[PDB]
Design an enzyme around this catalytic site. Structure first.
Site, PDB file in Angstrom:
ATOM      1  CG  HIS A  43     -58.191   2.400  22.473  1.00 46.76           C
ATOM      2  ND1 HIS A  43     -57.753   1.193  22.886  1.00 46.76           N
ATOM      3  CD2 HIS A  43     -57.364   3.207  23.127  1.00 46.76           C
ATOM      4  CE1 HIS A  43     -56.783   1.025  23.910  1.00 46.76           C
ATOM      5  NE2 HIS A  43     -56.484   2.408  24.026  1.00 46.76           N
ATOM      6  CD  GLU A  44     -54.847   4.211  18.858  1.00 50.86           C
ATOM      7  OE1 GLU A  44     -54.075   5.152  19.359  1.00 50.86           O
ATOM      8  OE2 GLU A  44     -54.769   3.116  19.342  1.00 50.86           O
ATOM      9  CG  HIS A  60     -54.880   6.684  23.957  1.00 54.81           C
ATOM     10  ND1 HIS A  60     -54.675   6.892  25.428  1.00 54.81           N
ATOM     11  CD2 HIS A  60     -54.843   5.365  23.488  1.00 54.81           C
ATOM     12  CE1 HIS A  60     -54.487   5.372  25.683  1.00 54.81           C
ATOM     13  NE2 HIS A  60     -54.633   4.652  24.669  1.00 54.81           N
ATOM     14  CD  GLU A 116     -53.620   1.493  26.264  1.00 58.57           C
ATOM     15  OE1 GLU A 116     -54.530   0.730  26.018  1.00 58.57           O
ATOM     16  OE2 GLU A 116     -53.699   2.641  25.990  1.00 58.57           O
ATOM     17  NE  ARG A 171     -58.608  -5.484  24.480  1.00 55.54           N
ATOM     18  CZ  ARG A 171     -58.525  -4.279  23.686  1.00 55.54           C
ATOM     19  NH1 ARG A 171     -59.133  -3.954  22.670  1.00 55.54           N
ATOM     20  NH2 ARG A 171     -58.046  -2.988  23.986  1.00 55.54           N
TER      21      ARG A 171
END
Length: 1257
Positions: A223-224, A227, A262, A363
């Site tokens: 995820h990072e 980004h 996001e 999730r």
């Protein structure tokens, strides 16, 4: 694959090349810290976040907490050499794990290639590297060297689990937004991880664990890194562009700092929340930014501070931005290459795709908010693996993602305290009454997007001219095969920078912290109140389950239970020590049956399975009852499940403007072709906008419902386990030694029961979501689409009529294309809009049926006549309309002014040309014509036209008619032929299936009992008004005793072919239930006469009473005849048959239902059987007397297979005796039981009840 070449130890000496002390840019002070170079352009600093921000050098908890879901603060963390080495090894292992997967390989290669732009120079013809994008390493001999890089892995801030990305910007230039890019700093910790609940991955892996599931750290690191991929390329969406959400409502959230960045880095359903207008705007914006970068590159010609050449940096930035170079060397941004790059970096470089490649559990949506943080030690190979991760292979933990469960893999995870207490950032809800206030966690509330985030450009007039115009794993594989991996930037030497690089972190917009503790007063016990009533604390008192939410919330020991009262009474009763175990499996089995309970009526085709306990679990629909929940769901649909109603406002679609052309046939036909094509894309766009709104609101509400159902089931299971443990621990020690009771097995069986119930719940909620999507959203868009199509059709007809001079010969062919294409809609395919497999399967199940894919379904459900297809709201039934008590679907209309039903299809749904391609069907019963008044008395039963335009169903003597009428008063009809002058009542007073198909372009057809009979062209008709109302009244009928028996009224939109009409005829024929002569349901304990097919003119009678006299057939039956009215054969008189039950389906008989046949002779009831001879091929049946029949067997099976009501008669021993044949004998008057007919024949009989539609005395 060797992403990290050397294995690094914190104790290793500094070298100045790979391990060295470095000084990153800052303002106040910079004490050098040790850094670790693991690959090109990536550095690791195993130190806490104190020096990249001079103002944020503190590590203690702040006086005010944050708006983040989970946070834990530790001061002496990452302060010791061994702990720092643990951090470094964890980071190295996570990078290796991510690089192992192909998507991770692509992401890391893109990260390496993404060198931030050198646009910090005021002079336009000079590429000067920005000082804040480079660091100062320190050689072991004192000298410090400035080096370029892209990403640095720093430890966390004062809050350990605020994993964020930070960068150093310029005073006026926005590096991360103008496409320039900037150096990113990641605050991370590979020893802390979150925990997420699971309620969706139960179908594929049924035998999974319970409790919390730990996030794979590689997922968060990916995820990072995504980004970073966004920010280094400069495509980072503006932070102030927040996905605005409503807050004023109690059920909503006080506020989320959710950004489009996001959503872009998440992917999947969250990425679909961005409507097409905004994503196209961002694509155009960053395309212009890339063009600006290309222009800056063109007019540079110089670089200051590098021993290399200019073309090297030119090529580096080209390979970064995927620019296109010409022969002259100028750079331009191709739209196709840029679109590929933006697609890859936006909707392909997503966390969901990584998770699908990690084959781990995550999730599903960004709205899934964590609750706990877990300490993990990733260094040892037995706790974590590069290839497999927490789910260790060739052992227990591999299957069903047990490696990430917090109760089965507790030797790898350690729970940590949460500073962010669940009741700190809350949105208080109070129910007025003794006020009942519960502090609902803000991250446990509904997600309600604002209307402003959804903007459309549909309301616009495109000028049609003569020269105008999914990502599964397969497309990811396709781009992986086309990806480039072997080209990576080098590390060239930039000239020495300042000793201390002055810099300041990019000022993120000042987030206005949402006001905590916002009170709300209500009058209804919401879902949150119920779920709060369903939990408790692990005390030691009596955990007594109660069926009252009110009493559960007023006592910590009492726990709300929505299960049946018998289970509650069983779990609460005091238990003897010996009977402890038996009570345990009793409760286990009863709990499993209660949870897996899928039941209730199936009188609906939209939703296959209705689960009633969701009613009193989450308080769906503001009722807590089984019957109320099922009735309200049938009455309304998925509307009740949603708490706030989505409001989609489709604009009036701008009319296409047809550019005029002269002396160009090719151009003027390309114009019509482009108009048709752009109509196709317009249909696509409206469907996509509807799908986006649905996914934003309805799907999120439904997903919260799924999670709350999982929590409710878990709470009930834990309450049962806790009371079982209390009973076990309450006994005497010796008895405990006797009973080898275990809690792990009980937990496992309850958890598997919960998993099965969750599979049921998931199917139900998918059905409800697709129900709402296809019932309350798609028709609204299709209305505007079809109105636009009608306006376009008129305009195109005008255009082709005007330009007929140059189109001689081809006028009709273009007329044909315009007429055919516009009158036929474009079907809705969910595979082009949503890639969720479960929703896709639910959609396929929905569309494979035709009853739910209609526009009007008059059905009687729960003492109310409703339309299962939500296309009307006001169905005004009259006071003089009757439904059959046995079958309430039956609806009968009289010749009264109030024997009507007003079907009003709302004006927000109906389009003008609705009745062009029109299909209708209904089962009808026309009684016998009694009086001569019916002659030349054409009466209309179904009326749609109000004054002059519409349809009108009329009926003549033996003639079914279908009358149309346009505005200019032209009338066309179609006719069915049946003669009332026939001895047998094939159609008179019987059940007739009448289907009418209206293809206004070509033909109009009428189908009777699934057979094409007649057709009259209606292409000469004018325009047809789509009237607001449908009139069900026998207007124009002079006879005062004339009525019809209609049922199953359906309106479709296409031309239903023969196969579908046959299928619907079979489906509504109810092949599983016997029918009498009239076609109605066959019953018990009622008089029924007898009819024969192979010998239709046989009058059944009796010769004598008892075994001494067998059944008789007394010659001719007689005929009924009135001059100039009707001629048939009398059906009444003779003997009487009564069906008596043997082995519920009350008053209704189904296929293979054993019954007793009763024969009435002279006001006395007799049995029909014979077991006296057992010779020949038949048994001479007789009217048996008294229940003393005994050895004689009268058991009868009606083998009502595909069709003729067969009458199979068996013995008392279970062996079949035979069918009732005629005689196999000389004198033709008997009733027998012959096995010969078992192996059109004589084994065919019908039952005639007293019908008022016949009128014979």
């Amino acid at each position: 694959m060797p992403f990290v070449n050397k294995q690094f130890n914190y104790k290793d000496p500094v070298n100045g090349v790979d391990i060295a002390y470095i000084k990153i840019p800052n303002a106040g002070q910079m004490q050098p810290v040790k850094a670790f170079k693991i690959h090109n352009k990536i550095w690791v600093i195993p130190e806490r976040d104190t020096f990249t921000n001079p103002e944020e050098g503190d590590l203690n908890p702040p006086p005010e907490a944050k708006q983040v879901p989970v946070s834990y603060y530790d001061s002496t963390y990452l302060s010791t050499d061994n702990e720092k080495d643990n951090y470094l090894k964890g980071v190295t292992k996570l990078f290796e794990r991510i690089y192992s997967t192909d998507l991770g390989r692509m992401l890391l290669t893109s990260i390496v290639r993404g060198i931030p732009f050198w646009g910090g120079s005021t002079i336009d013809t000079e590429l000067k590297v920005i000082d804040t994008n480079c660091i100062n390493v320190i050689q072991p001999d004192g000298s410090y060297r400035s080096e370029e890089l892209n990403l640095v892995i720093i430890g966390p801030s004062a809050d350990i689990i605020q994993f964020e990305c930070k960068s150093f910007g310029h005073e006026v230039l926005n590096l991360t937004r103008n496409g320039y890019g900037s150096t990113q700093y990641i605050r991370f910790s590979p020893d802390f991880t979150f925990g997420f609940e699971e309620s969706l991955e139960v179908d594929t892996n049924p035998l999974l664990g319970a409790g919390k599931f730990a996030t794979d750290p590689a997922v968060t690191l990916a995820h990072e890194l995504i980004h970073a991929g966004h920010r280094l390329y400069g495509i980072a969406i503006n932070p102030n562009r927040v996905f605005k959400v409503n807050t004023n409502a109690y059920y909503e959230m006080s506020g989320l700092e959710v950004s489009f960045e996001e959503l872009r880095t998440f992917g999947g359903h969250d990425a679909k929340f961005i409507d097409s207008l905004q994503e196209n705007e961002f694509r155009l914006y960053y395309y212009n930014k890339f063009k600006d970068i290309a222009s800056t590159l063109n007019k540079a010609k110089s670089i200051v501070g590098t021993t290399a050449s200019l073309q090297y940096m030119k090529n580096v930035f080209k390979e970064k931005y995927l620019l296109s170079e010409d022969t002259s060397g100028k750079f331009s941004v191709d739209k196709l290459k840029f679109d590929k790059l933006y697609k890859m970096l936006t909707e392909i470089y997503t966390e969901d795709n990584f998770v699908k490649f990690f084959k781990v559990l995550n999730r599903k949506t960004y709205l899934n908010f964590d609750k706990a943080v877990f300490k993990i030690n990733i260094v040892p190979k037995v706790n974590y693996t590069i290839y497999d991760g927490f789910n260790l292979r060739n052992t227990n933990l591999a299957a069903n993602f047990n490696g990430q469960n917090t109760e089965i893999n507790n030797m790898n995870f350690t729970k940590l305290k949460n500073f962010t207490g669940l009741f700190e950032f809350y949105k208080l809800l109070c129910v007025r009454g003794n006020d009942l206030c519960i502090k609902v966690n803000n991250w446990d509330l509904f997600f309600s997007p604002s209307e402003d985030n959804f903007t459309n450009d549909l309301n616009k007039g495109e000028e049609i001219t003569s020269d105008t115009n999914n990502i599964s794993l397969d497309l990811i594989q396709q781009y992986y095969l086309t990806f480039n991996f072997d080209n990576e930037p080098e590390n060239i030497s930039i000239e020495n920078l300042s000793s201390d690089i002055i810099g300041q972190l990019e000022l993120m917009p000042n987030i206005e912290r949402f006001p905590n503790g916002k009170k709300y007063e209500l009058d209804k016990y919401t879902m949150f109140h119920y779920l709060r009533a369903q939990e408790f604390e692990h005390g030691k008192s009596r955990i007594a389950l109660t069926n009252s939410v009110n009493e559960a919330l007023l006592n910590p020991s009492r726990v709300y239970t929505f299960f049946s009262s018998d289970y509650v009474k069983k779990v609460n009763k005091a238990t003897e020590a010996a009977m402890f175990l038996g009570w345990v499996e009793q409760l286990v089995y009863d709990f499993t049956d209660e949870t897996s309970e899928v039941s209730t009526t199936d009188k609906i085709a939209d939703i296959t399975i209705i689960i009633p306990y969701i009613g009193p679990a989450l308080n769906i629909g503001n009722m807590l009852y089984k019957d109320d929940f099922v009735g309200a769901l049938i009455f309304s649909g998925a509307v009740i499940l949603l708490e706030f109603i989505p409001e989609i406002a489709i604009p009036v679609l701008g009319t296409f403007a047809l550019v005029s052309y002269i002396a160009n046939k090719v151009l003027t036909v390309q114009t019509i072709d482009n108009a048709l094509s752009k109509r196709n894309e317009k249909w696509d766009e409206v469907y996509k906008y509807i799908v986006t709104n649905w996914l934003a609101k309805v799907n999120t509400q439904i997903d919260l419902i799924r999670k709350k159902m999982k929590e409710a089931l878990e709470n009930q299971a834990e309450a049962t386990k806790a009371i079982i443990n209390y009973q076990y621990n309450q006994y005497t020690e010796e008895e405990k030694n006797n009973i080898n009771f275990n809690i792990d097995d009980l937990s496992s069986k309850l958890n598997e029961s919960i998993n099965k119930a969750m599979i049921n719940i998931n199917k139900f909620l998918n059905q409800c979501s697709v129900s709402y999507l296809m019932n309350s959203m798609i028709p609204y868009g299709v209305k505007r689409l079809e109105d636009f199509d009608a306006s376009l059709k008129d305009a195109l007809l005008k255009y082709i009529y005007d330009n007929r001079g140059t189109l001689i010969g081809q006028v009709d062919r273009l007329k044909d294309k315009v007429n055919n294409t516009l009158s036929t809609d474009i079907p809705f395919q969910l595979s082009k809009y949503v890639d969720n497999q479960r929703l896709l399967s639910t959609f396929t199940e929905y569309i494979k049926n035709i009853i739910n894919t209609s526009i009007l379904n008059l059905r009687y459900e729960s003492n109310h006549l409703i339309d299962l297809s939500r296309y009307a709201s006001k169905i005004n039934i009259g006071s003089k309309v009757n439904f059959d008590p046995i079958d309430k679907n039956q609806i009968q209309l009289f010749n009264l002014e109030s024997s009507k039903i007003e079907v009003i299809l709302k004006n927000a749904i109906v389009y003008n040309s609705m009745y062009e391609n029109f299909s209708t069907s209904f089962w009808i019963r026309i009684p016998k014509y009694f009086n001569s008044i019916s002659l030349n008395n054409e009466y209309t039963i179904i009326n749609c036209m109000e004054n002059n335009s519409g349809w009108k169903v009329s009926l003549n003597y033996g003639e079914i008619i279908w009358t149309l009428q346009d505005t200019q008063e032209i009338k066309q009809r179609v006719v069915f032929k049946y003669s009332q002058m026939i001895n047998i009542s094939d159609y008179i007073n019987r059940w007739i299936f009448v289907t009418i198909t209206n293809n206004r372009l070509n033909n109009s057809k009428i189908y009777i009992n699934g057979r094409l009979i007649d057709q009259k062209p209606i292409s000469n008709l004018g325009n047809i008004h789509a009237s607001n109302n449908i009139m069900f009244k026998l207007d124009g009928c002079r006879d005062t005793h004339r009525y019809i028996w209609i049922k199953y009224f359906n309106l479709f939109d296409k031309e239903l072919n023969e196969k579908e009409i046959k299928d619907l005829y079979d489906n509504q024929s109810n092949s599983g239930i016997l029918k009498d002569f009239w076609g109605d349901y066959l019953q018990y304990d009622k008089p029924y006469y007898m009819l024969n097919l192979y010998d239709p003119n046989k009058y059944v009678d009796v010769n004598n009473v008892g075994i001494r006299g067998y059944m008789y057939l007394k010659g001719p039956r007689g005929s009924v005849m009135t001059t100039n009215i009707y001629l048939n054969s009398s059906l009444y008189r003779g003997t009487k048959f009564i069906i008596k039950k043997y082995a519920n389906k009350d008053n209704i008989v189904r296929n293979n239902d054993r019954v007793y046949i009763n024969v009435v002779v002279k006001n006395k009831e007799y049995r029909l059987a014979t077991n006296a001879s057992q010779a020949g091929v038949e048994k001479i049946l007789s009217a048996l007397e008294i229940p003393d029949v005994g050895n004689l067997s009268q058991v009868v099976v009606m083998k009502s297979k595909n069709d003729k009501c067969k009458m199979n008669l068996q013995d008392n021993n279970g062996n079949d005796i035979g069918f009732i044949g005629f005689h196999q004998f000389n004198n033709i008057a008997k009733l027998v039981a012959s096995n010969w007919y078992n192996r059109t024949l004589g084994c065919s009989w019908e039952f005639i009840p007293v019908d008022d539609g016949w009128g014979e005395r």
